[PDB]
Amino acid sequence: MENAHTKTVEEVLGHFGVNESTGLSLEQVKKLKERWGSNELPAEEGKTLLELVIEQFEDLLVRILLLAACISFVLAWFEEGEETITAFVEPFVILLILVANAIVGVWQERNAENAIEALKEYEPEMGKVYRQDRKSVQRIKAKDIVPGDIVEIAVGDKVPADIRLTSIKSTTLRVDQSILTGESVSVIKHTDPVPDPRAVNQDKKNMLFSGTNIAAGKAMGVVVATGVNTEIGKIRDEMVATEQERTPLQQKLDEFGEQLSKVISLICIAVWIINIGHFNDPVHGGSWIRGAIYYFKIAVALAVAAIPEGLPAVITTCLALGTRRMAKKNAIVRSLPSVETLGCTSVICSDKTGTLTTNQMSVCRMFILDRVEGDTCSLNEFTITGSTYAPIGEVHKDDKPVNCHQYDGLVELATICALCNDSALDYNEAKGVYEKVGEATETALTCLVEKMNVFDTELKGLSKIERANACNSVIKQLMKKEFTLEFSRDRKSMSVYCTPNKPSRTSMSKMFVKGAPEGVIDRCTHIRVGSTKVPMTSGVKQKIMSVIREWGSGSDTLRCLALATHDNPLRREEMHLEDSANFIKYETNLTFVGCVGMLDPPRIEVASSVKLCRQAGIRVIMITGDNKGTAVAICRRIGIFGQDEDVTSKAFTGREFDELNPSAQRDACLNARCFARVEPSHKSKIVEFLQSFDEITAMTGDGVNDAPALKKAEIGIAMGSGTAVAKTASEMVLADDNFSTIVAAVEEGRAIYNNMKQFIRYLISSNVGEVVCIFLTAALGFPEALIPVQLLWVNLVTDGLPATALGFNPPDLDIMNKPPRNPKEPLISGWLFFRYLAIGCYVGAATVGAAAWWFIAADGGPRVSFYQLSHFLQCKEDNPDFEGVDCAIFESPYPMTMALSVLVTIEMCNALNSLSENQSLLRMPPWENIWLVGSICLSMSLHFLILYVEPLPLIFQITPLNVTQWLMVLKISLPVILMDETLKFVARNYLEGISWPFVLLIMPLVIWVYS
């Protein structure tokens, strides 16, 4: 079987020796599985470790340091260069910081990839098949499907294998196959053979390919290819992927990175220009060229020192951390910008059924008409025991056991619930529970028919499997279902044409209708009392709707459904089923039978999630196709409204929203928290209206009525147990259906943005101090305190791992007590630019003051004055102003070490000021981020290493400091912490000591340092 689309259905069935009615036997599957194997594709890993490394060297800020490493290599090669790496220390330390941040970026991306693919195996994909071990459809694993068995598929499902369509149960089968073909519309399928053997997948209108979704209808067919033999499996190698655009935060940070490179370019040019004067100094041999080459390395080293080279690496590190942290909460994040866009979300539109409620329906109430008087009636209300899908329950008229065979209305009520069903009941022998095959609303009616034996059937010897659809089978053997008018949401009902099998021509044919109570009763012209039908009046209709409204707004919030039948339907040839608009024309002149009410409990974690979302400024709107009274009752249960809150202008229906002027539709979206009776087309209109106010919307849903809205919101979250159509149109999947995970994704996207601002605050406020040091020294006339190899060392130990460790920062304590952030506001605030300059002005002054301290105030050094230090270039033996002072002392490596030690130490303290934007170090101690503490101890260890290991001080042109000089380094470096604690204090108390173990740890050191 290689060209199945060209063969007749009978020929494809005869090929495998399979009957469509029963299915594939057990021993046949064992033979086929031994020959064809598991219905699964080989595990594909995302990216190669090499190509994952090349991705780290893509941004502009990283390419600048690659260019500077080349310039530093060529200049080192034109000079002496007769020696090993000790003469190439400048290019070596530029590449250490590049490969260090590249390792952390690759290591964090590999961890996020492993976490996501380990979540794909959370629940195995299932598939409905017909096999000879059960007379009904059974839910089996998708990987257990063999070529040949009969597979049943309904709307919203995912095609599990290549299938040749055998019969279309509905009127029209629409399939969404954009993943394989590329066309962006539903395809109409049929069951007739196409003649072309070389037909393209577009012309194969009788085949269904794996990985595609059924957009509308119900059908079944024969599997013809599994595993790698499928169309989507044969092209798994030809998987060229479209360019996924970078996150909107990455677009803000690349624009910032490009603007920062322009400021750095002007600064390093100014450094080379303000030093035009002393190019002919005797230190350069009086050569203008060798003096210009030297101050060219000053400008290149200052470019590397000031450029945030770890910025592209820390962006992808925080994003990969957010993807890994969500996978540990069972949340498959497909689109990368989704988790950081969720931090900016302001509205969370949510489906009610299946999404805000555990989709575990069970019919617990139903009523039929007992007797009807003049313009009024009396009901026969019942209650049903059982809340699961198990067919073990009992009907109670008035808290009394009753047999439903007595009531002719209950017999007709169960006939509609059995024949107007596309779902069934399946027993899971592995889990010992009855599962649903189809939708929860229709399965609740299947379980109901089993509990009420309207036709008394002995249930003694029947197994747990045969007990699932025992009472449904005896009803389906009576009436033959001719065709089905599938359920459409513009009509909110579903019809089924049946003819009784026994040929007595008693009630030759009938249509059994079920749907929304208000819409089906509006089309019923009569009512059924027992076995007699009576013309319906307005007083009877008013009482029937009163009980439905009482059930919805009741204590248990019953989801209601009206059941009706049509006594005189048209013939099949008279009905034109070429469209769904004509379906409502046939569902007229019905006779009302009864209503069923099923309970759908809200999820336990929804009430607390709404409480935390409102605390963070996020609004939760319920967009449901269900009744308005039921939706409002769920809202009061899950906390959207209060138990006594007035919801007059906060709860709308589909038509009520349509018949509103733009003035009220403006005031609705900002105030309405519940939308009921809305079609899938209206859900997109609600979401696009909220986006018209520039609000980030996070739509959550599970069904096919949510896919148009899931594609419209900025973020689309799908439930793990929902349909595959909703999961395809979504950027996030709650694999475990945990609604609290959505509130955790919001906090993660807020933490991602916070860890960027702490990164930007650390590198700018620190590298400005490295720029101030070089300009302040040139303005005072002092000897320059840093050579190009010392600027490249302070870049390595301060811009490397200590800066990347800001991405592992803990969340703030008020991270979720703040309103959502506008994604269009500027990246850096004006108040933040002040904090960057205030810290940068101290870092530079402290570094120049450290070298001025040694020349002027230190004991081991000389005692020159401020004048002899600002005019050190004119120091000669013949100078009376310079007496007793050596001119060689101005080339001492002691003040250069004092500046290099203060610069490294003051930036390690500045990184401790970056665990939070406004929280003090007393509230959030440094051990909250153990990655930052370890990175600071590693940077201070490498600094002590180049000071005291035997050959290194000569390489970097420094000198080992003693305890007295190291105490002065700490004396000047520590006040950078007190300065940020003061700026953090003003931000808390004017712009917007808990850890006592930490106070007892630093105070003894503060006393020792300051004596």
Ligand SMILES: Nc1ncnc2c1ncn2[C@@H]1O[C@H](COP(=O)(O)OP(=O)(O)CP(=O)(O)O)[C@@H](O)[C@H]1O
């Ligand atoms: N198989 C079915 N047959 C007949 N009527 C159905 C039906 N499934 C749902 N309905 C009815 O159609 C009405 C509206 O259709 P819709 O599919 O949008 O509701 P819903 O169950 O999806 C609530 P939500 O949108 O929150 O998931 C429902 O209230 C229901 O009474």
Ligand SMILES: [Ca+2]
């Ligand atoms: Ca740098």
Ligand SMILES: [Ca+2]
């Ligand atoms: Ca730095």
Ligand SMILES: [Mg+2]
């Ligand atoms: Mg839903």
